[PDB]
Design a protein around this ligand. Structure first.
Ligand code: HEM
Ligand code: HEM
Ligand code: HEM
Ligand code: HEM
Lengths: 143, 140, 140, 143
């Protein structure tokens, strides 16, 4: 997917300020709380019986980093999201059998997390740019 | 549909939002129009530029509808019947657009309520908006 | 939610389907598993081959649930509460899968009821299944 | 999208038997009846006040042929659905502002119409093959 220069600018500037140790975990965590069927894919992660349990869960946080890792890799290759997410696609689609709609949901949760973290700075234009990005990732994953 | 904790959580967020409700509704609308441009075709006669009086006025209407929904949370079908009629029958609003505006309403709350937008409250607000959306598409 | 004509139309299709209900439910399941392979992971312990006794037995259960739903069409939340609990809480069935099975149930009726599957009845059955699906995902 | 040889065989054999003057109209017609918000895109078509009105509407039938025309073109170019639907994509997305979910719905309606028309012959394997096809078309349109 192609971002305009201003779109690219909006995404890049904000992403530099992202705590890559934490935002991933907050997004995955929220996904599991907000869309609890997604918990079916993480029975090995231990206690997911409460929101606090999910959020504080070290494995959720740890795994969130990898997600965000993939998202960062996505931002670096906007013109080749297909090739970039090739392997993650095979993993989620053919081994994990995650429905692609859940990629869209995780993307939207990420956007909510960014809004939460940056407040006013997460302006409607900035949001519009990020929606393009998480849509691109989701579709790349879904190929 | 909504749990007592959900109802409690939604009431709390509403309370903190306070008199900003109208302004936040207008912001959610702007976010939707920018992020999901297909939605703009429902408002051909609106000026949808930033700071538009029409978007502001409309944001207040949205907010007021949502406030009426939480104020009558145990009977949203009845409370929202006229709006359901309007959206499905008259405006023929594509059901998918309700998820888009719901998401932007969540984003708008998130960007304004640091303290209140916890994971639990996030989950409750999402369910609340999905229920509102169900009612408003229930004439489908 | 459902109109009287809808209720009338759904009752009619059920009537014509008759004692094939179980067999058709099993066919819809097969159609879903083949067309949408991600759905199969909910049935790891099933044998999902053609002619599987387990798919047949399960198809009858589905059909019976749907029949109970039309038989209590004005109170599906109550009628389907245990099944709602089962699918959302225990099985954690992804809401999207309900649209997939609903589509395959429509396809299965279409392929078996030439006369009954009119545009109007199609529309009514779709709404009926969307309502059943809403209830069965209502513990989300 | 790639169909297996058996998948391709299942699609091709059935599609040869399709009345290309009618099935398109039945699918579009049903879409407008079953998902009535889609009627917003066809206010120029006249009477859509009843199912019978929609189905009997000459403009619906006429337009359905073009749809089916595009679908037939799609079946002919399974390996290049992207390029094939390029122009239809710009039309629906950038001029018409149809939400892509509606492409998926029209595809699924088409499948219901094929099932209706061919009964037992529209076997679960045959259906699975067609779902691959209508998914490919929808995603091509949505690019
Ligand atoms: C939408 C964007 C997504 C991204 C960028 C993403 C990324 C990743 C990454 C980087 C890994 C680790 C891969 C590895 O260990 O080599 C992973 C694993 C996994 N993902 Fe996601 N994912 C996404 C969506 C989802 C969703 C929505 C679900 C479930 C609801 C899911 C379920 C899983 C599971 C069960 C694993 C297992 C880890 C393993 O076996 O190593 N994924 N994903
Ligand atoms: C999700 C929660 C929603 C709420 C609470 C809501 C509420 C409202 C309210 C209160 C009005 C004013 C009605 C009146 O003045 O009589 C309205 C009008 C309208 N709504 Fe929404 N709505 C929602 C979703 C949507 C969506 C998703 C769309 C399309 C993208 C939409 C499109 C419209 C349009 C086109 C009007 C008429 C505007 C005009 O002509 O002045 N609504 N809605
Ligand atoms: C849409 C209408 C649906 C109906 C009417 C329905 C109905 C039923 C019924 C009656 C049972 C048996 C419950 C019991 O014996 O206590 C059942 C079980 C089950 N359902 Fe469904 N269901 C629907 C959708 C789905 C979907 C979409 C999925 C996932 C793709 C699903 C997955 C399951 C699973 C995994 C079981 C348990 C099977 C077992 O362990 O024996 N259901 N459902
Ligand atoms: C999913 C597969 C679809 C296909 C293959 C398809 C194909 C076509 C074709 C071939 C045309 C005529 C193009 C021309 O005149 O040059 C057309 C036009 C049009 N389509 Fe579709 N379409 C699809 C989905 C949809 C949906 C779901 C909607 C609305 C709910 C829609 C709304 C329209 C409208 C409003 C026109 C106007 C005709 C014109 O301006 O010439 N399309 N489409």
């Amino acid at each position: 997917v192609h971002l305009t220069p201003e779109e690219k600018s909006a995404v890049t500037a904000l992403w530099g300020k992202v705590n890559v140790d934490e935002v991933g975990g907050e997004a995955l965590g929220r996904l599991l709380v907000v869309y609890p069927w997604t918990q079916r894919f993480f029975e090995s992660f231990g206690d997911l019986s409460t929101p606090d349990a999910v959020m504080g869960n070290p494995k959720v946080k740890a795994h969130g980093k990898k997600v965000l890792g993939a998202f960062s890799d996505g931002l670096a290759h906007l013109d080749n999201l297909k090739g970039t997410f090739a392997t993650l696609s095979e993993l989620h689609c053919d081994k994990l059998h995650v429905d692609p709609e859940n990629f869209r949901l995780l993307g939207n949760v990420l956007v909510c997390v960014l809004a939460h973290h940056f407040g006013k700075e997460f302006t409607p234009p900035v949001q519009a740019a990020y929606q393009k990005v998480v849509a691109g990732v989701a579709n790349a994953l879904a190929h | 549909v909504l749990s007592p904790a959900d109802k409690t959580n939604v009431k709390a967020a509403w309370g903190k939002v306070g008199a900003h409700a109208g302004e936040y509704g207008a912001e959610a609308l702007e976010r939707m129009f920018l992020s999901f441009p297909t939605t703009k075709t429902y408002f051909p006669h609106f000026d949808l530029s930033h700071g538009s009086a029409q978007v502001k006025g409309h944001g207040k209407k949205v907010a007021d509808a949502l406030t009426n929904a939480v104020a009558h949370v145990d009977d949203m079908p009845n409370a929202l019947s006229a709006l359901s009629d309007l959206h499905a029958h008259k405006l023929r609003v594509d059901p998918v657009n309700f998820k888009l505006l719901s998401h932007c309403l969540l984003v708008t709350l998130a960007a304004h309520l640091p303290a209140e937008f916890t994971p639990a409250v996030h989950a409750s607000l999402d369910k609340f908006l999905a229920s509102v959306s169900t009612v408003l598409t229930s004439k489908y």
